[PDB]
Amino acid sequence: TRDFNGTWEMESNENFEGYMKALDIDFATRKIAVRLTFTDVIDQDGDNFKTKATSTFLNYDVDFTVGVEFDEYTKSLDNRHVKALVTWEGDVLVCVQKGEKENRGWKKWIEGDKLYLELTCGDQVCRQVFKKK
Amino acid sequence: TRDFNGTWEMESNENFEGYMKALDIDFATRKIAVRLTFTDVIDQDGDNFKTKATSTFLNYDVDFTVGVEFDEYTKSLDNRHVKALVTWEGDVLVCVQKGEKENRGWKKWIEGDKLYLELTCGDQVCRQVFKKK
Amino acid sequence: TRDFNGTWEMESNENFEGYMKALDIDFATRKIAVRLTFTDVIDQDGDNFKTKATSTFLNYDVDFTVGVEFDEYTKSLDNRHVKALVTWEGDVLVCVQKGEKENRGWKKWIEGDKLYLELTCGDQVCRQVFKKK
């Protein structure tokens, strides 16, 4: 069909970074665009086209079972490969990420109606708290 | 007129880069902030003000008709000036963007309810697939 | 408790930059990630977990009363500390931000249903106009 009309949500994006590298794009905007997804609204009347490309950040998925070792590529962060294992310590989810970095992992627990997540590596700890919606 | 209450959506942003350069802001976040739009929710009680400044990415717009060469400032990416021409090859939209980069263009076609877009430059092609929502 | 099911919206992010630096993450993606907040939807059936981490830009909140000088940490821009004061010039909000940069401030006013904001540092002025929604 010749009809490109409608709203299109991206599902795949292969060699986007290589394409941008060939375009002589700069490290900053290459790192910006590599963490996105796009939706194109095309309005097409015969041979007249009006396109609008909206971009937002691509969700990151992590699926695991407690006690089962899995392979995690932290595309969210440093894009490293680690072997991750999660355990129950009382009501605490303790995850160890074995790999190049020492003392790397996180701990997650809930107090009241708020969630507490401590991400750790080398000596740097990061404390984040989330509210339930 | 002293009443700033409400949600205000941006329509213009002139010399934002120059303002940030005068603030001597760094290339990374300058490249991030130049691709944004802002919406300010103001709650104003007399002389008391409560600000919310939300930031969103900039919708990239492209309007063209098949067969007429047009001028494209390829923002979103390398911010280059190209002379672009799109043609129908059967049911495929093939556009070549003549400019500094050689063999630069793209192809667009439809299979069922999926859109296929191949962006090309030198030897690097990037394949993207979109689902209709 | 051991039930992490639901949607959790972030309200703090402490030592994120040190954590990312320890991960040997790059200035570009560190500068982007410091300008974000996250919302995680967790689906947990017993010991099976399915997490989805959505990313959205941060919200720059600014609270002031007209005539009272306040302290502003411009995390949106140069991450500088300035002592800011807002005054009425007719129906225009004129704010001076005393600090390292000279002649730094802004002006805000309403014409009809549009908002006009002029950000003024050294020699560079930046004009932004918003439409009321």
From Swiss-Prot, chains A, B, C:
InterPro entries for the chain: Calycin, Fatty_acid-bd, ILBP, Lipocln_cytosolic_FA-bd_dom
Family statement drawn from the similarity comment of this UniProt entry: Belongs to the calycin superfamily. Fatty-acid binding protein (FABP) family.
Coiled-coil regions, chain positions: none
Gene this chain is encoded by: RBP2
CDD domains referenced in this protein's UniProt entry, alphabetically: CRBP2
GO molecular function, one term: molecular carrier activity
Domain description: Forms a beta-barrel structure that accommodates hydrophobic ligands in its interior.
Tissue: Higher expression in adult small intestine and to a much lesser extent in fetal kidney.
Subcellular location per the Swiss-Prot or TrEMBL entry: Cytoplasm
Cross-referenced PROSITE patterns: FABP (PS00214)
Organism: Homo sapiens
Sorted UniProt keywords: Cytoplasm, Retinol-binding, Transport, Vitamin A
GO biological process: epidermis development; fatty acid transport; vitamin A metabolic process
Annotated all-trans-retinol binding sites: 40, 108
Known function: Intracellular transport of retinol.
Protein name: Retinol-binding protein 2
Source domain of life: Eukaryota
One Gene Ontology cellular component: nucleus
The keyword Cytoplasm appears for this protein: yes
